[PDB]
Amino acid sequence: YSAKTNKAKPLPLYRESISPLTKIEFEITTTTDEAGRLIEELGKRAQAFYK
RNA sequence: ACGGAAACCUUGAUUCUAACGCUACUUCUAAAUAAGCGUUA
């Protein structure tokens, strides 16, 4: 989608993708204190990055 | 027709017994298989 053309143009690039609304679990391990603050702040940093 | 003749420096003996080329040590450290879609129509 181009902001200049103001329309969406399709391209020959087809991918195998996970469908929307799929639940996938990850485990994250932290061995120090600073990284613990970083990972406990993964939300509100994701929000700041998205803002 | 010689201070000469005859006479083994010889027999039996394991350079042998015991003794770990052993003790400790992460092939380890960061890293989205990902980015760009212009211009014409």
UniProtKB/Swiss-Prot annotation:
Top-rank taxon: Bacteria
Coiled coil: none
Family under the similarity heading: Belongs to the CRISPR-associated Csm5 family.
Subunit structure: Part of the Csm effector complex that includes at least Cas10(1), Csm2(3), Csm3(5), Csm4(1), Csm5(1) and mature crRNA. The Csm complex is elongated and slightly twisted with a maximal length of 215 Angstroms and a diameter of 75-80 Angstroms. It has been modeled to have a central protein filamant of Csm3 subunits along which the dsRNA helix of paired crRNA and target RNA binds. The filament is capped at one end by Cas10 and Csm4 and at the other end by Csm5; ssDNA is thought to bind to the N-terminal HD domain of Cas10.
Miscellaneous comment in the UniProt entry for this protein: Encoded in a type III-A CRISPR locus.
Record function comment: CRISPR (clustered regularly interspaced short palindromic repeat) is an adaptive immune system that provides protection against mobile genetic elements (viruses, transposable elements and conjugative plasmids). CRISPR clusters contain spacers, sequences complementary to antecedent mobile elements, and target invading nucleic acids. CRISPR clusters are transcribed and processed into CRISPR RNA (crRNA).
Record's protein name: CRISPR system Cms protein Csm5
Portion held of the full protein: 205 to 255 of 357
